[PDB]
């Protein structure tokens, strides 16, 4: 009497991922108070306006 | 001399005799940029002989 096995596997795994995010913005203003000017062209992320 | 009235707002001033004007041309420009960015890769293998 005589019995072989063989077995093999073989598993891959490849991921990948990216993100680009820019932004970009430039209020500007004449004329009024120099600090009004500062204040208000200084841009609020959150509210642009 | 000089002695012209010179305001800025409520304040009034006295210009010098060289200086031919000094005046509140008031303006400002902001500027903002900002850039993220991210890359990852995985690689993985498993084998096995038996
Ligand atoms: C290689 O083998 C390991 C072990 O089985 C794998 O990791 C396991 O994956 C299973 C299913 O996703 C999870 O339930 C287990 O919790 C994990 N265990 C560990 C220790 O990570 C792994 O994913 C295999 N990799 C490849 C490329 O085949």
């Known amino acids: 009497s005589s019995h072989g096995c063989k077995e093999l596997e073989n598993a891959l795994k ?3 991922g990216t993100q680009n995010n820019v932004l970009r913005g430039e209020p500007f203003i004449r ?3 120099a600090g009004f000017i500062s204040g ?3 841009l609020e992320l ?3 306006a | 001399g000089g002695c012209s009235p010179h305001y ?3 304040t009034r ?3 010098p005799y ?3 004007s000094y005046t509140p041309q008031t303006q400002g420009k902001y500027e903002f940029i900002l850039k993220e960015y991210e890359s990852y890769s995985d690689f993985e293998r498993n ?3 038996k």
């Open chain 1, 14 to 16: 490849a991921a990948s």
């Open chain 2, 13 to 15: 001033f006295r210009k």
């Open chain 1, 46 to 48: 959150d509210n642009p």
């Open chain 1, 40 to 42: 208000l062209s200084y």
């Open chain 2, 47 to 49: 084998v096995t002989e």
């Open chain 2, 8 to 10: 800025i707002l409520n």
């Open chain 2, 18 to 20: 060289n200086v031919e």
């Open chain 1, 31 to 33: 004329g009024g108070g």
